[PDB]
Amino acid sequence: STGSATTTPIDSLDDAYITPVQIGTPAQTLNLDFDTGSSDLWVFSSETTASEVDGQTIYTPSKSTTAKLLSGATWSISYGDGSSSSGDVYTDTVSVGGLTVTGQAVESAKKVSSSFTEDSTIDGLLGLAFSTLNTVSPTQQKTFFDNAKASLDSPVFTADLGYHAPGTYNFGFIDTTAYTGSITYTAVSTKQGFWEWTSTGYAVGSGTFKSTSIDGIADTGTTLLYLPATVVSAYWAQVSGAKSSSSVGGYVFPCSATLPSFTFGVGSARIVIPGDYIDFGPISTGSSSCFGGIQSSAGIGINIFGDVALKAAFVVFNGATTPTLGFASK
């Protein structure tokens, strides 16, 4: 089997992407944030504290003839940005782009943190990291991909995120029309539960490539590119007036700037992030100070190849017995 679904930016900055997902019978379609950096599929629901729901579409398990309470199971997750959610668990039928999994754990939110409430466009998350990170207790549950894998034509999914435009998540096949040149594959460590890999270096603008190993995660659920402070300083040094602002919480730059590109290495291959992808707009409405899309990972504890990086590529998440990641230009 295969599936193919369009993923759409939630706003004009590509802060996140939503993908429609069918849950239950009859289908209830929710727009979920596909997150290769986590492993829980959780939704706003009829059980979510009423004051914490503000415009989201909710899953109502009582209206699904295939929903079953997973007795005794609870979940609770805290994300890197300090957001969080928790609740109980149903199993139900879940379909993405024509690909159906029966008995998928659908984690129903009883509580969500303010950032989730305040984002009316995201109805929940669909985790695509390794199932070892799934938070369901006392019986850990599998991700949608893990459940689907054996049925897929090939045990892969691909992320093709757009810049200020829709893109695509495919399951079970590689669309050879969706990228240019060849796909370069690179090793993955699953030791931390993430799609963790080692970039071979970077360049800033038209500058020379610096060969250096940068271990990080491919994380579709993180907006920005978080890299070591040395790398980030080298980038922003090429932008007149750019500075790190502790009050704002990262590098800012004059909105009048033209940003240089940033290149990262995948083996001997190179992915170029155009300068415009690195512009996250005014820090507050009407400000001429703009927020940078490349930020320091210092004090996160891990480097993160988030959407800023991934949307410059066609990315293969290869879930074969030994997982790997592939990157192609597009």
C-alpha to C-alpha distance for 217 and 273, rounded to whole angstroms: 17
Of 173, 163, 169, 125, which is closest to residue 318 (Cα–Cα)?
173
The encoded tokens of residue 6 equal 């369009």
- Asked if residue 103 lies in contact with residue 143, where contact means CB atoms within 8 angstroms, the answer is no
The string of DSSP codes covering 129-166 is S-GGG---BSS----HHHHHGGGSSSSEEEEE--SSS-
Map out the domains of the chain as residue ranges: 5-174, 175-330
C-alpha to C-alpha distance for 15 and 91, rounded to whole angstroms: 30
3-state percent helix, strand, coil for the chain, nearest multiple of 5: 10, 45, 45
Distances in whole angstroms, Cα of residue 6 to Cα of each of 82, 174, 284: 28, 15, 30
Q: Which residue among 45, 131, 199, 296 is the active-site one?
A: 199
Query: What is the C-alpha R_g of the chain?
Result: 20
Of 153, 125, 188, which is closest to residue 315 (Cα–Cα)?
188
C-alpha to C-alpha distance for 42 and 34, rounded to whole angstroms: 11
Q: Which residue among 35, 40, 88, 92 is the active-site one?
A: 35
C-alpha to C-alpha distance for 271 and 263, rounded to whole angstroms: 5
C-alpha to C-alpha distance for 8 and 75, rounded to whole angstroms: 27
Tokens 């820090």 locate to 283
Resolution stated for this PDB structure, in Å: 1.3
- Asked if residue 202 lies in contact with residue 213, where contact means CB atoms within 8 angstroms, the answer is no
C-alpha to C-alpha distance for 204 and 210, rounded to whole angstroms: 9
- Asked if residue 86 lies in contact with residue 135, where contact means CB atoms within 8 angstroms, the answer is no
- CATH code that applies to domain 5-174: 2.40.70.10
The encoded tokens of residue 210 equal 């610096």
Of 300, 312, 220, 307, which is closest to residue 36 (Cα–Cα)?
220
Residue 235 DSSP symbol? H
Distances in whole angstroms, Cα of residue 54 to Cα of each of 17, 36, 89, 252: 19, 26, 22, 31
Q: Quick one: which H or E segment has residue 310? A: helix 307-310
The experimental technique behind this entry is X-ray
Q: How many CB atoms lie within 10 A of CB 207?
A: 15
Q: How many residues are listed for the chain in this entry?
A: 330
Dihedral sign, Cα of residue 46, residue 49, residue 54, residue 56: negative
Of 244, 272, 279, which is closest to residue 258 (Cα–Cα)?
279
Q: How many CB atoms lie within 10 A of CB 166?
A: 13
Q: Quick one: which H or E segment has residue 308? A: helix 307-310
Distances in whole angstroms, Cα of residue 78 to Cα of each of 36, 57, 65, 134: 15, 22, 31, 12
Of 270, 210, 198, 200, which is closest to residue 234 (Cα–Cα)?
210
The string of DSSP codes covering 108-134 is EEEEE-HHHHT-TT--EEEE-S-GGG-
User: Is 279 marked active-site?
Assistant: no
* Candidates 2.40.110.10, 1.10.3720.10, 2.40.70.10, 2.40.10.10; CATH matching 175-330: 2.40.70.10
Give break positions in the chain: residue before each, C–N beyond 2.5 Å: none
231-252 exposure pattern, b = at least 16 Cβ within 10 A, e = fewer: bbebbbebbeebebeeeeebbb
User: Is 153 marked active-site?
Assistant: no
Backbone angles phi, psi at 75, to 5 degrees: -145, 155
Residue at 319: amino acid letter: G
Q: Which long-range contacts (CB under 8 A, 24 or more apart) does 76-81 make?
A: 76/135, 77/38, 77/40, 77/42, 77/135, 79/38, 79/221, 80/37, 80/222, 80/300, 80/304, 81/115
Say if 5-174 and 175-330 have the same CATH topology.
yes
The string of DSSP codes covering 70-102 is EEEEEEEEE-TTS-EEEEEEEEEEEEETTEEEE
> Mapping DSSP to helix (H, G, I), strand (E, B) and coil, where does residue 278 land?
helix
The encoded tokens of residue 44 equal 């706003």
Alpha helices, DSSP H, located in 183-284: 229-236
- Asked if residue 58 lies in contact with residue 46, where contact means CB atoms within 8 angstroms, the answer is yes
Distances in whole angstroms, Cα of residue 61 to Cα of each of 46, 49, 250, 287, 288: 8, 15, 42, 45, 47
